[PDB]
């Protein structure tokens, strides 16, 4: 039978990668955080204070409050077939800034131009949506340089 301590089953998780042992780099400490940013959790096994519980490893959430050397992040979780919000305390050594909003922020920068012109000249924005890839395109071909294919390889 299995046990139920705070760091159960973390032999693979919570171990350093090959040729990457030691303390964190300066960039870790010089990064500034703000309320409302999206942030991503990855535990560093060498630091023993401010570690989250291993369920949260590799998950992304939103910063709710900022303190001297730690952050409070909001998560959601299913328990007993219902949704529950959870507020997780994490030290700054175990977090990295998330990339999940990157494309959306670029798109907002384009929208922000159009939405002004749409008051002056038009009435409503064109709004620049994405579209999924359509059907295969048409082609005009010169028809020299033909290559033949054959079952010449007998494959003993």
């Amino acid at each position: 039978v299995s046990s139920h301590g705070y760091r159960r089953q973390t032999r693979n998780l919570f171990s350093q990668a090959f040729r990457k042992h030691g303390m964190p780099n300066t960039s870790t400490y010089l990064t500034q955080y703000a309320v409302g940013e999206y942030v991503d959790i990855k535990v560093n096994p060498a630091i023993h204070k401010g570690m989250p519980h291993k369920y949260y490893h590799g998950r992304t959430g939103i910063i709710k409050e900022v303190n001297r050397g730690s952050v409070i992040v909001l998560f959601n979780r299913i328990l007993a077939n219902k949704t529950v919000e959870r507020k997780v305390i994490v030290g700054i050594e175990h977090i990295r800034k998330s990339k999940c909003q990157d494309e959306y922020l670029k798109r907002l920068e384009i929208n922000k131009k159009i939405i002004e012109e749409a008051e002056k000249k038009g009435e409503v924005p064109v709004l620049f949506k994405r579209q999924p890839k359509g059907p295969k395109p048409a082609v005009e071909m010169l028809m020299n340089n033909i290559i033949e294919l054959s079952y010449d390889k007998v494959e003993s």
Binding site: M23, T26, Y29, L30, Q32, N67, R68
Partner: protein, 281 residues
């Protein structure tokens, strides 16, 4: 045993570059520079003091993501502008360099007229004048050098304080400290204005005039005597506070690129090997 098998090399992890070179202590650096997440707009300045066989360097440095930025710099070798002839790594030359460094800063920030100089007459920390702008703030970075009573790094630090910058310090480190008694500041003043060396010069002339000439040849060439030092140092300090050194000019030493060696091409490397086989047979 170890270095005899390939696996030794295949599994090895290198230290960071400035650690291999024995120039930086990363455990110390991180405690010194790490950001406080609530004090937004705080921008801590390190005072970096380093001592070479030739000279004393003071730099004021701010740590930013991507690389440290130098705000201002001063070097004991520049004191030759104000007529310093001798002892560029002396305890006095340490103090003088810290003084110079401070003034250059407070001029850029325009605090210079508010926070006046004060030549080594107390052991208190610099205090914010009411109704005016706050003092410029810094912390001391001594690197890999040891802390002990009367180390030259602390002389430069007192220089900066006397110059008007706010550094927190404890008097435990200066000559003239006593374990359970008031501070004897005349001993400190004595060293700043060079008494320690005068007292050595005076001794040797009674002991061994041959050894004296060997030990102090450079001083002799300047016709300096043990008696002259206080006047020398008083003038030097005043001049630092009073004057300003001329700006540096920029020049293209680009043409010295003639001296740079260039690596062999592939074509050459191959022919060279070919010839080596033929020379051997």
């Amino acid at each position: 045993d170890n270095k005899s098998k390939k696996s030794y090399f295949q599994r090895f992890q290198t230290k960071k570059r400035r650690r291999r070179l024995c120039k930086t202590n990363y455990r110390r650096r991180t405690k010194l520079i790490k950001l406080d997440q609530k004090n937004v707009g705080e921008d801590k300045s390190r005072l970096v003091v380093r001592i070479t066989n030739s000279k004393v360097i003071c730099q004021v440095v701010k740590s930013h993501l991507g690389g440290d930025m130098v705000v201002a710099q001063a070097t004991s070798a520049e004191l030759k502008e104000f007529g310093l002839k001798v002892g560029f790594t002396n305890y006095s030359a340490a103090y003088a360099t810290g003084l110079l460094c401070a003034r250059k800063i407070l001029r850029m920030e325009k605090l210079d007229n508010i926070y006046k100089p004060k030549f080594c007459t107390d052991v208190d920390v610099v205090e914010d004048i009411e109704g005016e702008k706050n003092a410029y703030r810094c912390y001391l970075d001594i690197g890999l050098s040891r802390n002990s009573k009367g180390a030259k790094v602390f002389a430069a630090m007192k220089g900066a304080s006397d110059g008007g910058i706010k550094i927190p310090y404890s008097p435990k480190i200066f000559p003239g400290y006593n374990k359970d008694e008031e501070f004897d500041q005349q001993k400190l003043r004595d060293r700043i204005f060079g008494k320690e060396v005068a007292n050595y010069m005076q001794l040797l002339k009674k002991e061994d005039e041959t050894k004296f000439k060997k030990q102090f040849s450079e001083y002799i060439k300047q016709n300096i005597n043990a008696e002259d030092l206080e006047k020398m140092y008083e003038n030097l300090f005043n001049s630092i506070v009073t004057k300003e050194i001329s700006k540096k000019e920029k020049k293209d030493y680009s043409a010295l690129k003639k001296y740079k060696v260039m690596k062999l091409t592939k074509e050459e490397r191959d022919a060279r090997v070919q010839q080596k086989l033929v020379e051997n047979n």
